[PDB]
């Protein structure tokens, strides 16, 4: 009766910035998803392939829990086939994605008076991320023909930017915490199951 550590992911004190999104692997555990699906805490609960209930009756080779913070304005980018700054340069879901995207407003936790500057996102990148790719590059982005040699200036821009969450922002600009559960199924025997 080794239950999986979903509380460590959902009830964590601090969340990762989306460009450096956190991934925790879930293996050799009994998973009770009831705690999450019958929960009034979440504003977003989209499931692909699987159904949100149906869920404690299935098994999987591995479960990946990816956590980060974006603005609610961008939550709809966490979905297959989406485009935009977040989907292109921060966190990309595959087209055959089977899993659930769970999101909730976190203004009590991630907004600070005068701005919270600990949550960043990538604005500049040469090409789109592949599904489940992670880029923690900090190199100055060269927008012009002249190189930048680690110096900022015209046509040389830092590739990351702070969200700057303030509690007075509108709900569209407020911080939302996002957890993406991916259900990996392999040849190998299943290691994560519901109480079923």
């Amino acid at each position, epitope marked *: 009766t080794n239950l999986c550590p979903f509380g460590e992911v959902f009830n964590a004190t601090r969340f990762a910035s989306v460009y450096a999104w956190n991934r925790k692997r879930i293996s050799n555990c009994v998973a009770d998803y009831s705690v999450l699906y019958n929960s009034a805490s979440f504003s977003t609960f989209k499931c692909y392939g699987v159904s949100p209930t149906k869920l404690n009756d299935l098994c999987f080779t591995n479960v990946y829990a990816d956590s980060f913070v974006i*603005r609610g*304005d*961008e939550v709809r*980018q966490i979905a297959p086939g989406q*485009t*935009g*700054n*977040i989907a*292109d*340069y921060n966190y990309k879901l595959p087209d055959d994605f089977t899993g659930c995207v769970i999101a909730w407003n976190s203004n009590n936790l991630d907004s600070k008076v005068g701005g919270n500057y600990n949550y960043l996102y990538r*604005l*500049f*990148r*040469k*090409s*789109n991320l592949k599904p489940f790719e992670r880029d923690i590059s900090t190199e100055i*982005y*060269q*927008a*012009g*023909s002249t190189p930048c040699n680690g110096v900022k200036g*015209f*046509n040389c*821009y830092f590739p990351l*930017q702070s969200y700057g969450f303030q509690p007075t*922002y*509108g709900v*569209g*600009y407020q911080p939302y915490r996002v957890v993406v559960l991916s259900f990996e199924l392999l040849h190998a025997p299943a290691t994560v199951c519901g109480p079923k």
Partner: antibody
Amino acid sequence: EVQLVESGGGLVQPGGSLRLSCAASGFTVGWNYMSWVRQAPGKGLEWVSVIYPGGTTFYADSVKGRFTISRDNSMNTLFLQMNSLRAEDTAVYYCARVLPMYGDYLDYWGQGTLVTVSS
Amino acid sequence: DIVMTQSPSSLSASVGDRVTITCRASQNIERYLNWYQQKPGKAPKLLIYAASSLQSGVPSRFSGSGSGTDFTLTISSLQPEDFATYYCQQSASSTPEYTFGQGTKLEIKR
């Protein structure tokens, strides 16, 4: 020095097609957010299209399904391919470089090219 | 679609005067508002970004302020070269949904 030069505008019959070009000099178009904005004669500015450095594109509702934005890196040129042109598309078309640092704003504009849709 | 309404539509003032143009957003856009200047037959020029940030190379007599739904562009001492049409532009959504105000035409009185 930085320059954006538009070309390819002219007379096009209703329902026809036309490809506008925007040659850039300072920045390299491949690595930049780029935008097409239009202005009907005597009226205001209307956003048309935008392309991200990764290649993802976005269009205003007035032109989706008819306009497509693209680029040539070796030519350092942005392109706007227009199909099924109507009379309401008659306008000056500007390309502009877009910076995403505080929302999206257009810090460098070309001088535009005129597109007249008439029979 | 966010609607940006500019006021007034037209305005005339004398050289050295202080001029204020207002622009109002249909919804909360925070400080994602830019101001552009367009002189006849020439390329539009960025004056202000981020509501109050003055763009590099733009004379200091141009000032931006506002937040939420109300914004103002101020010219502290009007110059003859400042005759033009001024446009506010919103960029609130993270997905491109840009909208412009209808523009204010500023002519010089002499």
